[PDB]
Design a protein around this ligand. Sequence first.
Ligand SMILES: *[C@@H]1O[C@H](CO[C@@H]2O[C@@H](C)[C@@H](O)[C@@H](O)[C@@H]2O)[C@@H](O[C@@H]2O[C@H](CO)[C@@H](O[C@@H]3O[C@H](CO[C@H]4O[C@H](CO)[C@@H](O)[C@H](O)[C@@H]4O[C@@H]4O[C@H](CO)[C@@H](O)[C@H](O)[C@H]4NC(C)=O)[C@@H](O)[C@H](O[C@H]4O[C@H](CO)[C@@H](O)[C@H](O)[C@@H]4O[C@@H]4O[C@H](CO)[C@@H](O)[C@H](O)[C@H]4NC(C)=O)[C@@H]3O)[C@H](O)[C@H]2NC(C)=O)[C@H](O)[C@H]1NC(C)=O
Ligand SMILES: C[C@H](N[C@H](C(=O)O)[C@@H]1CCCN1C(=O)[C@@H](N)Cc1ccccc1)C(=O)N1CCC[C@H]1C(=O)O
Ligand SMILES: *[C@@H]1O[C@H](CO)[C@@H](O)[C@H](O)[C@H]1NC(C)=O
Ligand SMILES: [Cl-]
Ligand SMILES: [Cl-]
Ligand SMILES: [Zn+2]
Length: 576
Amino acid sequence: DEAEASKFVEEYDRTSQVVWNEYAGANWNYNTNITTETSKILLQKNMQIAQHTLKYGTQARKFDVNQLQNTTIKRIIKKVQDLERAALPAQELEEYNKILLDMETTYSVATVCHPQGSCLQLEPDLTNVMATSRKYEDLLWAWEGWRDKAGRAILQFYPKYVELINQAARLNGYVDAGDSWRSMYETPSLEQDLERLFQELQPLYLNLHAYVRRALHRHYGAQHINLEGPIPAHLLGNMWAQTWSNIYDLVVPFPSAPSMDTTEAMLKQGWTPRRMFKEADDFFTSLGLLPVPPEFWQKSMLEKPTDGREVVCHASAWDFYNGKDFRIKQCTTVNLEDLVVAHHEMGHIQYFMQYKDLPVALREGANPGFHEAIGDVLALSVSTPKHLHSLNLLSSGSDEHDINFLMKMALDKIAFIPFSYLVDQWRWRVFDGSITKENYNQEWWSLRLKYQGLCPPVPRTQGDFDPGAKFHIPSSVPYIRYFVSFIIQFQFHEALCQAAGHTGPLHKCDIYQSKEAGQRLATAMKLGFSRPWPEAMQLITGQPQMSASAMLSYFKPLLDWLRTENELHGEKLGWP
Ligand SMILES: *[C@@H]1O[C@H](CO[C@@H]2O[C@@H](C)[C@@H](O)[C@@H](O)[C@@H]2O)[C@@H](O[C@@H]2O[C@H](CO)[C@@H](O[C@@H]3O[C@H](CO[C@H]4O[C@H](CO)[C@@H](O)[C@H](O)[C@@H]4O[C@@H]4O[C@H](CO)[C@@H](O)[C@H](O)[C@H]4NC(C)=O)[C@@H](O)[C@H](O[C@H]4O[C@H](CO)[C@@H](O)[C@H](O)[C@@H]4O[C@@H]4O[C@H](CO)[C@@H](O)[C@H](O)[C@H]4NC(C)=O)[C@@H]3O)[C@H](O)[C@H]2NC(C)=O)[C@H](O)[C@H]1NC(C)=O
Ligand SMILES: C[C@H](N[C@H](C(=O)O)[C@@H]1CCCN1C(=O)[C@@H](N)Cc1ccccc1)C(=O)N1CCC[C@H]1C(=O)O
Ligand SMILES: *[C@@H]1O[C@H](CO)[C@@H](O)[C@H](O)[C@H]1NC(C)=O
Ligand SMILES: [Cl-]
Ligand SMILES: [Cl-]
Ligand SMILES: [Zn+2]
């Protein structure tokens, strides 16, 4: 009956709200007051939600959904039939939840110590080392040490995790966990579409890579940089070499056009975590988008707590499933990177608020990439010299300043493309059994080489598990969403710049206060997961494909500059 599928999704919706709230409830209380008290309540909440998932998922499975007339109801029920981990038998479920928890915990408490000297955590201590050291051996120490202590300690967990995550996926009708993850895009052509997009950004990436390598050669010495080879992975200013803007100082196109210390000026002006998020909120509301509610301000955690209570520090945005309570937890450092991340997280919150009246099953982004993209869009405008100046973080003109800013943007946006691409290429092949525990690491480095053109500064040996040194691997968060985000964020920016009436070069656009730009975003965000994502894309951009052409157009002046510069020096693009 049509009416009985209707009643079912109504009940699911009512009961999911309550149960999901309680779990987000408990999970929050844990994350922002790790104790074994909150940790014991979290465990009990895990079983509660698994038990509701099972109850509802079993019932949803009894609907012959072909026969379902209403498309929203068909779509909700189809999703409820996926139990996720709740599909597992009781034993396996217990052990998977515990694997996830032990992996996350291992990663987040791992420290690197000098022999009778200090122990360094990943944030801020090792992150700052990677960002600011210019000494090969000091970078290597932090780079190797992090892998020694985080990645190797993940390895004892990973095989069992893969086994249980694949098992849950097969139990929900997928072939393996990767297949389950890719199905979030509802795009049978996903893998080839992503490949084409990655191929489109190779000229820009290869030219960026070659110019950066020559600049490293100049700093680190001819004996340590091969001008036709991969770059050693510890020299890019970032623990994973996944963004390169901390070595802007070594690579500036035009040293003659100096620019302000963004970080120093924020500090210099006593920016706090709160001002950072307040500025993010202001940008959202300038677009006519929704302000975060008063509750957000009361309950969010915007900086490492100081009552000596212990917390999980990775920036994250939280929906509590009651249409009222949305939160961010981030141990905000006062710097440029973190201001972007504030925007990133605030984009998540905006989406939560835009779709909060849908059925919970439809409360997701049009695809995971759209969710990751929202904040970054706003942040592209934020990073303009024009905007940074309006916030009193830059002094201003020239072609030089322009090429300098593009370079700064490139070391964030372009460098991340291969990295964000390779992560799930690796995991997809682990999940499908192509990569086994005997070759996790070797296959990671194959992809690190093939896609990013990087090599490990020291030989890896059996027992290393470098992937486990990147948060999302032990936390089991899919990563392709970030490669998608990075492409479609420039298309969004181009479309909103167009809505806003900007003309001339795309990278000069700043959509601050554009109500036309807000309306495009709001309409798409309001859809949630109610319609195939090409419809949200078409709402924003007027067409329905993912496309690198906007990112290319944004970067085109930099492409020309890098070609001229690379050609002048005879660079050989790539790493034979
Ligand atoms: C197939 O089924 C789907 C699903 O049906 C729904 O779910 C199933 C399981 C059954 O329960 C159904 O009975 C139930 O209808 C059908 O899709 C639905 O179709 C109707 C319209 O035909 C849509 O109604 C719109 O709903 C929005 C918002 O909905 C929520 O939020 C409101 C405000 O917060 C609140 O008033 C509602 O009660 C509702 O509540 C939420 O419900 C979800 C669960 O569904 C729950 O999880 C939430 O927690 C809960 N929220 C709260 C607060 O508790 C509503 O805003 C719309 O109003 C406008 O639309 C009318 C039509 O044009 C218009 O006459 C009104 O004046 C009003 O106008 C607009 O108002 C705006 C803003 O103020 C204004 O700017 C505009 O100018 C104005 N527009 C005009 C005049 O053009 C509206 O009623 C449902 O959204 C929709 N559900 C979804 C998400 O798909 C589908 O129709 C069926 N298909 C077929 C083949 O028939
Ligand atoms: C810091 C940023 N943090 C993430 C993040 O915000 O995504 C955190 C951790 C990963 C999940 N996450 C969240 O906050 C989610 N609750 C977001 C979400 C998931 C599903 C549905 C809706 C919303 C991040 O890792 N980033 C940011 C860019 C690159 C990547 C990285 O650091 O490697
Ligand atoms: C932290 O946890 C303990 C045990 O759950 C609790 O009693 C205490 O109130 C919490 N502290 C804060 C500040 O939330
Ligand atoms: Cl690595
Ligand atoms: Cl994803
Ligand atoms: Zn995110």
